Design a protein around this ligand. Sequence first.
Ligand SMILES: CC(C)=CCOc1cc(NC(=S)c2ccoc2C)ccc1Cl
Lengths: 537, 404
Amino acid sequence: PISPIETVPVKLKPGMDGPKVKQWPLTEEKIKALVEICTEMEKEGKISKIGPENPYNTPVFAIKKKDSTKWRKLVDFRELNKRTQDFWEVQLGIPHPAGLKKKKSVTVLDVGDAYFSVPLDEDFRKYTAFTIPSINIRYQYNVLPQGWKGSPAIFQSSMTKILEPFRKQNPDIVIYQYMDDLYVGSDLEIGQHRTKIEELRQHLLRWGLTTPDKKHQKEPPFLWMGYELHPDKWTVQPIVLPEKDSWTVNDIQKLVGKLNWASQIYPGIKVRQLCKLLRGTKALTEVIPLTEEAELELAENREILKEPVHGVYYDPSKDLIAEIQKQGQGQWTYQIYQEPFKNLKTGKYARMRGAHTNDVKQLTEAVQKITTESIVIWGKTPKFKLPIQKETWETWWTEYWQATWIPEWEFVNTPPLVKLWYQLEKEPIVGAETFYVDGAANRETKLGKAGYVTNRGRQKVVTLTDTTNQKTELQAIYLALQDSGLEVNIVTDSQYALGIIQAQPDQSESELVNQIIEQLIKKEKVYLAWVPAHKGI
Amino acid sequence: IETVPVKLKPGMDGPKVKQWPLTEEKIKALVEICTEMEKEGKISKIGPENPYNTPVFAIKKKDSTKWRKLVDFRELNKRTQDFGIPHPAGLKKKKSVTVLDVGDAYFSVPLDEDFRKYTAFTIPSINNETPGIRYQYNVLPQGWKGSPAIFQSSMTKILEPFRKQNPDIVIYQYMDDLYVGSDLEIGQHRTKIEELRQHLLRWELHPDKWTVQPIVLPEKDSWTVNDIQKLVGKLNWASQIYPGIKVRQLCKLLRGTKALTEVIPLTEEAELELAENREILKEPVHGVYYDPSKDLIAEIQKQGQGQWTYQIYQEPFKNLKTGKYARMRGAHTNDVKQLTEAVQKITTESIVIWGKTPKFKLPIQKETWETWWTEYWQATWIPEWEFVNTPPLVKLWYQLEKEP
Ligand SMILES: CC(C)=CCOc1cc(NC(=S)c2ccoc2C)ccc1Cl
């Protein structure tokens, strides 16, 4: 059935013209079917015949429904879609379960073939020209065509208008459109709810939009991209891991993919040894001998995934609480809840060390990421429970070179606490050895020397094969740190070292930097100073 | 009224910037504000057939507890054609200036039909449970560059009387704001401002006090190897600005593997060299002149303890102005607050002085900034910015700025 709604003006992108592709030759059976089917929607007014005044054409296909029984049709709009204008956002984001609120009842109204109910822009219609050839009849769409770029866009806005009055009339009823499904929830008593649904159904019917009756309507639980939605709680469908005897590269990858998704809900899941089987993989279908370490790991993961998890929905009248935990260097797990242990959402992040960072900086980044997803989901920011002392945060941020911040938070004594691994002295140490370190290397030959000399007479130097200047400088610093006692003063002219003085990183991409880092941590008191190069010093 | 045809620069297309997530609190504020404007015919709902978009958000000014809608037309403005438009070099000398929000005036004037599409903006929804509410302007939009331009005529008329009867007062219009400066003492100034308000209805700053501060060098009774080392480093780098600065005589004292704590007596030669350097530092470098055809740039450096330093320049080391900034009372626990405030004051000065907004180089991670800048913004305009890594040397230098 067609509807009396204002068509949305659709034009082809500036400078382009309608489709003109060839029509495939078909079997008499594929033709018979298309003739019959097309005559059907023809009588319905969905499609109208056209003459030679239309030079456009789209390829029509015929595919039997699941397993060669009755015949169905398909139109390949690929080209037309390329020439059609762009519309605004189709779905600017999906509602995450943790952002929903509980309802006494929810019903989904499949407005199925409503696409063919909304009238297309009359002018544009011509571009939808297609043909049913003989073995040895032209048509065009008068309504939104299945597969056409603009259909979903137009269809959505249409439903929006049509529903505007019903929503106003019923501000206690929640509707949510997704594709051709209409999710409607409420907190009314079942009988009342049933009534309003019908009223809605009739309101839609008033615009030709046919919808199924109670006898043919779907109901909860609702499978929503991973979650199993219930009117009072959402559930995570326990993930199944196939116990194979022979594994291929491809298989391992897909496995790790599913496992990595799981880790958000089930922290504890590990894939280190499983990822290790990919090293040097020559082909996607090559078989890999599962290392016992991987067997133990894969097994432990199945136990974890045995216990299904279910949580609660958002309660607007309650505060939001976000707690974070560091599982390892650069790994943080967080869970957001309103009532302790009654989780809304959980998650984790893996931070590739990158250039040079420190745990507090990483904590900061977690806090940041969380704050953002919260705003998108709940429209507000959580109060944070962070495994770090107010003293530590204060010391670090007040002197850090970059602007940084953490919203209202509260320390939670849940080990392991994140702390400052070391802190360079602000002024030279009295009664401490002074190492004047320096390193240089021939850029081209990759050959260098790293060394130092102390005010206490101590000296050293090393020749380095296959090194770079930046490395040499750092190596010098490493040596000074190795041969020095608990207290050390080190002067260098390395501009790169200036980075450490400022950022004081406790993790880096460079293994060498890390060596220095470990040494710095071991020291009681270190004072690092920089002096300009090629001068008197 | 009859509308002037506005167009995009040739070959350009409308902005298609995505909306940032907004808090419940401000989504509400916007919906309310927009339903009202819609009734008043300022804006209209649009369909998906319009693909353009521009970010929107709400802020409350200090001394204001009522939400005010703000749009990010930066992208559009950049694509909107240029169009006579003055800047009084005397406003920079006034004893006092007052900023005025004349944004409302624009809503009276209609916007050319064909350009309206390009002003599309979207009110989002919490958890995407509802489609975005799409609107577009029908009248002149606040924060757009074309608006002050087209309203120019009407504006000059309205002001001419106050102008002719008070040629001793300077009035400058930069977008939604009007800067009124006078040398008249606070009494007459404030009263004359209130009068000017009424004049408009019917239809505190201090400009040169912003004196560039010199770089002061430390003074000790006795200097240590470390002290000298720090000093020499500062100067060596500083020679990029003042080439007359020498550091050899001092560097000479630094020869030898001495302990950093070792006390060193200055040679009469070194003493001179230093005294001479202080002299050169007593005043800003010669040869720096503003070029209206080049972009203005502002660098900011977190100095800790609530202090921040900045430099406005067009070419590196050739600074037009430099200054320090102490955090406002209230932001005692957060940088983002202090930074935005700083950004705002600096942009203002740039306006007063050159009538142009500086491109900022901010010492902050993009994410941190994007997430919270709106929460503290209180200006009708939005300047350009990029995120950078503060070089240790440039920081140590400006740290040495003179104070009262
Ligand atoms: C996202 C989605 C599939 C919603 C329908 O399923 C549920 C939704 C809710 N709660 C809300 S607030 C709702 C219901 C219809 O539309 C909305 C926005 C609760 C339980 C289920 Cl099972």
